[PDB]
Amino acid sequence: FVIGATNRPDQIDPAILRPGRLDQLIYVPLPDENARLSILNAQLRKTPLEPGLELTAIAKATQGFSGADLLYIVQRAAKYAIKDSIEAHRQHEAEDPVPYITKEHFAEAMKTAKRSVSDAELRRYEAYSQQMKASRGQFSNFNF
Amino acid sequence: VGGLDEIKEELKETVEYPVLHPDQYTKFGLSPSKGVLFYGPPGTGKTLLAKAVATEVSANFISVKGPEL
Amino acid sequence: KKDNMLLVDDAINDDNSVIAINSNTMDKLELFRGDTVLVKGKKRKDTVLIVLIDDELEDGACRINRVVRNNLRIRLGDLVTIHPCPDIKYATRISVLPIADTIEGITGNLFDVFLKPYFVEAYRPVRKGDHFVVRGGMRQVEFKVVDVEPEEYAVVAQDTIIHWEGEPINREDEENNMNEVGYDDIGGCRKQMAQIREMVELPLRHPQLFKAIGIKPPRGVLMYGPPGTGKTLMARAVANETGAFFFLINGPEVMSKMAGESESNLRKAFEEAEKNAPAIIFIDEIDSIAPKRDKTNGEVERRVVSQLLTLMDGMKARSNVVVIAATNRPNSIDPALRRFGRFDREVDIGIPDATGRLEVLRIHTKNMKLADDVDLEALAAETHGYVGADIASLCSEAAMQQIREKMDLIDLDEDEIDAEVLDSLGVTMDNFRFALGNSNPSALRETVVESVNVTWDDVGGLDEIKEELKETVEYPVLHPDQYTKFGLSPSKGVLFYGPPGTGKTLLAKAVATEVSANFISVKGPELLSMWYGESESNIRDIFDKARAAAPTVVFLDELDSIAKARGGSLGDAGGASDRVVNQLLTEMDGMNAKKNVFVIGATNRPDQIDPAILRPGRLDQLIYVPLPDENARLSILNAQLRKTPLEPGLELTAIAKATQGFSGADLLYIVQRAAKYAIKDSIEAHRQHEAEDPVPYITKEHFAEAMKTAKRSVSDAELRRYEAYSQQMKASRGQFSNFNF
Amino acid sequence: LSMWYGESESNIRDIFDKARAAAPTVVFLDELDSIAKARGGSLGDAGGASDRVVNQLLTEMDGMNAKKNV
Amino acid sequence: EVGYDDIGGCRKQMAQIREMVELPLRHPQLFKAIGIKPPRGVLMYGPPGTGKTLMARAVANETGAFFFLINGPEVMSKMAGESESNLRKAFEEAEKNAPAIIFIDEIDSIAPKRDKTNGEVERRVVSQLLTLMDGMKARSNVVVIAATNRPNSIDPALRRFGRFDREVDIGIPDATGRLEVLRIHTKNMKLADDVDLEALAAETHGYVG
Amino acid sequence: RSVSDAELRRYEAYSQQM
Ligand SMILES: Nc1ncnc2c1ncn2[C@@H]1O[C@H](COP(=O)(O)OP(=O)(O)O)[C@@H](O)[C@H]1O
Ligand SMILES: Nc1ncnc2c1ncn2[C@@H]1O[C@H](COP(=O)(O)OP(=O)(O)O)[C@@H](O)[C@H]1O
Ligand SMILES: Nc1ncnc2c1ncn2[C@@H]1O[C@H](COP(=O)(O)OP(=O)(O)O)[C@@H](O)[C@H]1O
Ligand SMILES: Nc1ncnc2c1ncn2[C@@H]1O[C@H](COP(=O)(O)OP(=O)(O)O)[C@@H](O)[C@H]1O
Ligand code: BEF
Ligand code: BEF
Ligand code: BEF
Ligand code: BEF
Ligand SMILES: [Mg+2]
Ligand SMILES: [Mg+2]
Ligand SMILES: [Mg+2]
Ligand SMILES: [Mg+2]
To answer: Where, by residue number, does ATP 1 bind (chain C)?
Structure first.
């Protein structure tokens, strides 16, 4: 069972994409609003979170984002929480304060967050997918 | 691996079918499918799907980089 | 906790053969004032002494004089097991000898003077190997019990025959006896130590568990890992404490010039190890007698491999013997030799942790008179990528630095050194700090960065960039507990892009001077070669060396050079830049462990960079370092003029306000032109004053004549391109707002 | 310049190490029209080698070195 | 015969080598009072023509310890099992007689880093060196000294503590070092009375050794 | 489908040449 994971299917030889060697050409698209919520739930599985915090606004605000961008948002929120915790520790030593990630950490982490892929590469991937679907021409309900 | 439900289920069944039920495959008289290729935008879950295949599926895993060999 | 083990305490009773227990210890374990008890301490040594009720002792630890304490190889604050032995009985004869340096000067009857009154009517309980002390005649002599007739230990009743001889020795033998390496010197690899010690010790102490379970224990150890980790020390401790027969085999030691002699030597070695006793065979450096049987071209190597494979597992293979191997690379070994029965359990003695380095520091600094103010926790926390064998080099360098400091002020006295300075030497903390600043890990000795001297206060302006870089560098280094409590991986990558002459390389140098992590730096095309795949091998080796001695930070300079996007050439150059890009994308985020790999990238052309490497997980922080404003211009003018004499009436506000389009390199050019004009004026004034310090600082006139040829570096088109790229990166942040919940 | 992949950058690194090794030396970089060429983009192997030798000059003239006397 | 006063101009590396050569052999009382064994490995690298062989000759002629000289490729042979035997014979001859000093000149010819070459004999020689320099009862009162022109073509297991721990950098001298070299080499030639050496040392810049 | 359209053009050109 060979598995290929290539981020550019143009430079592949056309004799390897032939069935019998690599027949399952699975296109992994960008996540939508129902998949970004599950990605944010899976990435925040082993962390303490605020009971009033929801990820629906984070899934609805970002529309062209990716899992790496959501992981970057989560890591920036965790870095801001660690900075606030070490600031509270330094103030307590001068004179557990942060038990979970609050909403202000996410609101400050979602200010310097951008998408990874641009619009031209997404158009190139949709063009390759439509070329592969044009290779699936003359297909219908297929009554016998 | 958040999301990718149909891709995850199809990859998982394509791996686990000929290693658990070979009797139906020799009853139908056909060889199973072997390869699978993931392609798309970078940072989407291809290597994460490969790690999820490597960590818990009963088949032995041989990992190799591109220009490593 | 069985109350039969006690700690060593200072001695009240100054007698040699005695230990003091407390009365609440006597009822807790039945013993008496005359009872002779066997003390067994560390390093597999023993001694015999008289127990005596001591009120001050306090039941938990025992008082023993420095002589007993020495024979057991223990210190004040070490644990020992105590247990009584009345099986011992009065001696038939004894064999004591004076240590040479304790009798240099005198001669004659040592028996009548020292030994006779020392043993008389005390019937002391001595032991073989003991070194006792007798004070008399204005000196203290040290004898060592060399032999007794009634086994290892016996008593010296008046009828016992004391034999002393006079050919005394230098204490080379005493030093060797003290050194024997003990199991408690390889601290730092607990799981690998237990995995070796289990199959070494359990089928030798009691085999009833294996006789009841029916199965046979594994008889093969393969210790692989980085060089300088403790595999030879583990084999030496196994050879030194385990009482079975030992046989060490070097790698190219059996090889002989005769046809068929190396295999005969291996057969004779295995038959000698099997003939005597159930033994342990340590074959060191097995990469020279096992070249995988396929890549080699000779015949003697293949026959040695076949001899090992037949003699290790075949017909009547091994009768209760265990083989241990040690190697620096596990991959160049035959897979038939990496099989069960021959070499089955492969322990991985790898790079230690903070507590492992603290254990190595506490082990290596337990015999020296160190200090009263040196802590080892900060030394173990600031040491990051040491392989475990460089800690002894650190302590040796600190001791040599202290000795070199003590040798220069006070005179050396080359005929004979005065012994007053030997009692007060110590090892201070600044010696350890200088030894830490003047050393490196043994794996990163080939990619050492040259000693640049900059400071975080020498990089003016860019306060948000500096604090963000300091946060990104020093949060997973100083606080791993918060990151493992939140259960998330820290951000590692950062990219610097902007106009040239701004401070990206200066920020990289300020990182390379004073961060709490190791530094590995490369140039742009520096890791490229002319062969096929050698650039890939260089990339893989430098990333394995960066992730091995973690945490390190990698400065990938000129990402435009080392990484194109993909396939940009119409005619390819062999298809190598795409492979370099693919290997970079795989090593920065692939199927690895990702312990600590910080990637710093500084480029001045962000258009030719791969979007797959501009993606989070490899390089997420796209830090844009812009041109300085008025306040940043004033701070870089104050920072570039940090160490210089200046006029007190000098005002840099007009210089900061008049340029308004300059950069750090152009202001450095202005400062250098002013310094060159001041140097020319000083040379002219000195020549005038020597023909028939003239200037002690730089005046305003020098800056006024140096600011006549000042010109900007960047044009108005490259700045347009950089601001267009920044506006496109801000337009990638679309469909966003203040985001109030 | 050379035919192989990286030999021109190796020659640049070698001549700059020879310059900064026995310092002070002075280097006469002739024909910067031939060496630098102001990279831009040309979509070719000559443009790739020009970008590589320009970035090697950028990392050798002002890079992470001692910059004693060049 | 050359002495310690003929390598003028590299006094820092001279002191760094002279410490570990003289102080553990002259009086070991400080090392026995501190309870720390001294380092036993020298690796003199740098540009070709700096004075490493002259330093080896100086520490050979000055100290009263035994000096066994081992060249780079002189231990090699054609038979299988002879170069390792020559290295073992050299090490036992240096260990049996006295506390001695070994000078392995040109170690880059018997250390091909065990990864870029396909010959088994070179790997066997490197394994013999790694075993003889750090193993069971490895070194007793002996010390090895290396000298090579390139410092990167050596095995990292050979560039380790216990084998080669003090890698001194005998580099190019400054103007005072050129002044000392000009004053040392012109001590046996009656040249003139109206000649100076300060301007001769300050004129040149790239003259090494 | 397995093969693209340009590969068939190349194979037809080679079959017309040979
Ligand atoms: N669908 C996803 N669910 C959860 N995490 C994800 C997902 N996609 C990406 N990530 C996170 O971002 C990283 C990048 O994904 P990865 O598979 O390595 O990218 P690629 O497809 O380029 O090989 C993952 O390792 C993971 O940490
Ligand atoms: N984990 C460790 N604990 C204690 N000492 C160590 C450790 N690792 C290395 N050392 C020390 O490093 C020195 C050389 O190590 P050694 O065992 O001879 O080399 P290697 O690990 O290559 O087999 C010795 O002084 C040894 O005590
Ligand atoms: N922002 C700055 N702050 C302080 N000094 C600077 C700054 N920018 C440039 N300099 C000075 O000019 C030199 C050139 O900067 P450097 O980092 O080497 O170049 P670059 O900006 O191309 O990466 C620095 O070494 C320093 O002496
Ligand atoms: N630093 C130096 N000081 C004094 N003489 C030197 C120095 N370097 C070289 N020489 C002289 O140069 C000659 C060759 O130097 P040598 O020590 O053999 O160097 P190498 O073996 O590295 O080529 C000798 O005659 C030596 O006296
Ligand atoms: F496309 Be991913 F970065 F492997
Ligand atoms: F013997 Be060690 F691993 F160099
Ligand atoms: F490194 Be600089 F931007 F020239
Ligand atoms: F030429 Be020498 F060995 F540096
Ligand atoms: Mg991947
Ligand atoms: Mg070893
Ligand atoms: Mg730079
Ligand atoms: Mg020489």
So the answer is: 227-233, 328, 364
